[PDB]
């Protein structure tokens, strides 16, 4: 079964917080309301939109002992006409449910949750900024809530959603084979809390070595998997002399991003160059770099969208990536086309109106 948006209960706030006047630091500023839905042996209770408030959790809650937790991330955008739209939200709903099944957490109806999320954004519509490059970040979470120390499928769970208003400079990456984000047969291809905790120390290491993000390598052939919490793309002339955009395939160690899929879809549509999903090795990159075949390297993801890379520290070898000296033409094109779609300049099936 599932909760229904028709059963939504609304509790407007009586202490509305002051909106930001000024820099928006990602994921630190929250809106006045939140979605909340509980599950137990009776199934799903009724969804409610209520004032933003703390969670109350039993000390034995399995969300805190055995990381029975998963999350999502998507953006709503306000056009000049003040119309708010969510970017490809159905894909997040699909991904959220796959995550839930992987952690033996309760299933729900994707279209019911999306509607609840729509209602929640509608209540807080004034929190959605409209300055250029600004958006509203939507964070759905599902956690197990069993008050028991046995490692087991939970009999209670909690689904909730909070919102943040959020506000092109290239980055350097540390590429060290010692660090492993995920493995074939693991859970790196699901957006589960457990995949993130262990990266915090690796990210501090990147900073100490003068880099900004982590380029996650995998396997004997040092495959480029992902960059920070973003998917990685390479625009180059491949060894066979063909110009292509390549990103790693979904073989278990890649989180299937929405921006990622969107970029593949966009480039495939254009039909101007080869667009493939194939592994990428450091060996291939060094060679392509020495032969001037790399045009652009970039990460993709909701929070930072499409972010260029200019440097990769591979062990002690400091490699210049000429992304910015190549425009970066593809990056700009993607950003321009995405911006048109996102802010309702060009109406498109990808957008879901709030």
Q: Which residues bind its own copies (CB under 8 A)?
A: 25-28, 30, 34, 52-61, 63-69, 71, 73, 101-104, 137, 139, 141, 143-144, 147-153, 160, 162, 164, 177-180, 183-187, 192-201, 203-204, 229
Judged by CB under 6 A, which of 61, 63, 135, 213 binds ligand 4VR? 213
Given the DSSP bridges, would you call strands 213-218 and 171-175 parallel, antiparallel or unpaired?
Answer: parallel
Q: Could you tell me the smallest distance in angstroms from the CB atom of residue 40 to ligand PLP?
A: 27
Residue-by-residue DSSP string for 97-109 = HHHHHHTTPPP--
Q: 282-301 in b/e burial notation, b at 16+ Cβ within 10 A?
A: bebbeebbeeebbbbbbbbb
Task: Give the chain's length.
Answer: 354
Q: Which helix (H) or strand (E) holds 267?
A: helix 258-270
* Number of chain positions touching ligand 4VR (CB under 6 A): 16
Kindly state the smallest distance separating residue 58's Cβ from ligand 4VR, in Å: 16
307 contact choice in ligand PLP, its own copies, ligand 4VR, none (CB below 5 to 8 Å, kind-dependent): ligand 4VR
- CA 312 – CA 321 distance, rounded (Å): 7
Among 14-22, 139-147, 228-236, 345-353, the segment contacting ligand PLP (CB under 6 A): 228-236
**CB closer to ligand 4VR, 112 vs 146:** 146
Interaction of residue 259 with ligand PLP, rule CB under 6 A: yes
- Only one of the segments 30-38, 54-62, 157-165, 300-308 lies at the binding site for ligand PLP (rule: CB under 6 A); that segment is 300-308
Q: Are 71 and 138 in contact (CB under 8 A)?
A: no
Q: Is 328 in the site for ligand 4VR (CB under 6 A)?
A: no
Residues 6+ apart with CB under 8 A from 181: 188, 195, 199, 214, 216, 218, 225, 226, 253
Binding to ligand 4VR by residue 347, rule CB under 6 A? no
Does residue 171 belong to the site contacting ligand 4VR (CB under 6 A)?
yes
Cβ 301 to ligand 4VR shortest distance, Å:
5
Q: Is 137 annotated as a binding residue?
A: yes
Closer residue to ligand 4VR, CB minimum distance, 121 or 141: 141
Q: Which residue number, 135 or 302, has a Cβ lying nearer to ligand PLP?
A: 302
Q: What is the DSSP letter of 237?
A: E
Which CB, 3 or 66, lies closer to ligand PLP?
66
Q: Determine whether 35 is exposed, middle or buried from the number of CB atoms within 10 Å of its CB (0-12, 13-18, 19+).
A: buried
CB of 74 within 8 A of CB of 96?
A: no
- CA 350, CA 345: separation in Å to the nearest integer? 13
Nearer to ligand PLP, 164 or 288 (CB): 164
Residue 53 CA to residue 200 CA, distance in Å, equals 27
Q: How far is CA 187 from the centre of its chain?
A: 16
Could you tell me if 319 and 284 are in contact, meaning their C-beta atoms sit under 8 angstroms apart? no
Interface residue with ligand 4VR, options 47, 140, 188, 301 (CB under 6 A): 301
Interface with ligand 4VR, residue 168, by CB under 6 A:
no
Nearer to its own copies, 91 or 187 (CB): 187
Annotated binding site for substrate: 137
Contact positions vs ligand 4VR (CB under 6 A): 73, 149-151, 171, 213, 227-230, 299, 301, 303-304, 307, 309
């Amino acid at each position: 079964s599932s909760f229904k948006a028709a059963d939504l209960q609304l509790e407007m706030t009586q202490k509305p917080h002051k909106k930001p006047g000024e820099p928006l630091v990602f994921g630190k500023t929250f809106t006045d309301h939140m979605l909340m839905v509980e599950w137990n042996d009776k199934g799903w209770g009724q969804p409610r939109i209520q004032p933003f408030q703390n969670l109350t959790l039993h000390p034995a809650s399995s969300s805190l002992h055995y990381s029975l937790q998963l999350f999502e991330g998507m953006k709503a955008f306000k056009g000049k006409d003040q119309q708010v739209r969510l970017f490809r939200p159905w894909l997040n709903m699909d991904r959220m449910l796959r995550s839930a099944m992987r952690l033996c957490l309760p299933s729900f109806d994707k279209l019911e949750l999306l509607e609840c999320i729509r209602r929640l954004i509608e209540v807080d519509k004034d929190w959605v900024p409209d300055a250029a490059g600004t958006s509203l970040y939507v964070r759905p979470v599902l956690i197990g809530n069993e008050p028991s120390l046995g490692v087991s499928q939970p009999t209670r769970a909690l689904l909730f959603v909070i919102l943040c208003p959020v506000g092109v400079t290239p980055v350097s990456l540390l590429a060290d084979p010692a660090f492993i984000r995920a493995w074939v047969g693991g859970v790196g291809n699901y957006k589960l809390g457990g995949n993130y905790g262990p990266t915090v120390l690796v990210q501090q290491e990147a900073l100490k070595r003068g880099c900004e993000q982590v380029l996650w390598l995998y396997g004997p052939d040092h495959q480029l998997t992902e960059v920070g919490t973003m998917n990685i793309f390479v625009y180059w002339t491949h060894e066979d002399g063909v110009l292509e955009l390549v990103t790693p395939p979904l073989n278990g160690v890649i989180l299937p991003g929405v921006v990622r899929q969107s970029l593949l879809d966009m480039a495939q549509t254009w039909g101007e160059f080869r667009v493939v999903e194939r592994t990428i090795t450091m060996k291939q990159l060094l060679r392509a770099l020495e032969e001037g075949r790399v045009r652009e390297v970039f990460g993709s993801g909701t929070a930072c969208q499409v972010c260029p890379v200019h440097r990769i520290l591979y062990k002690d070898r400091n490699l210049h990536i000429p992304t910015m000296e190549n425009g970066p033409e593809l990056i700009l094109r993607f950003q321009k086309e995405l911006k048109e779609i996102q802010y309702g300049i060009r109406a498109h099936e990808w957008m879901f109106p709030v």
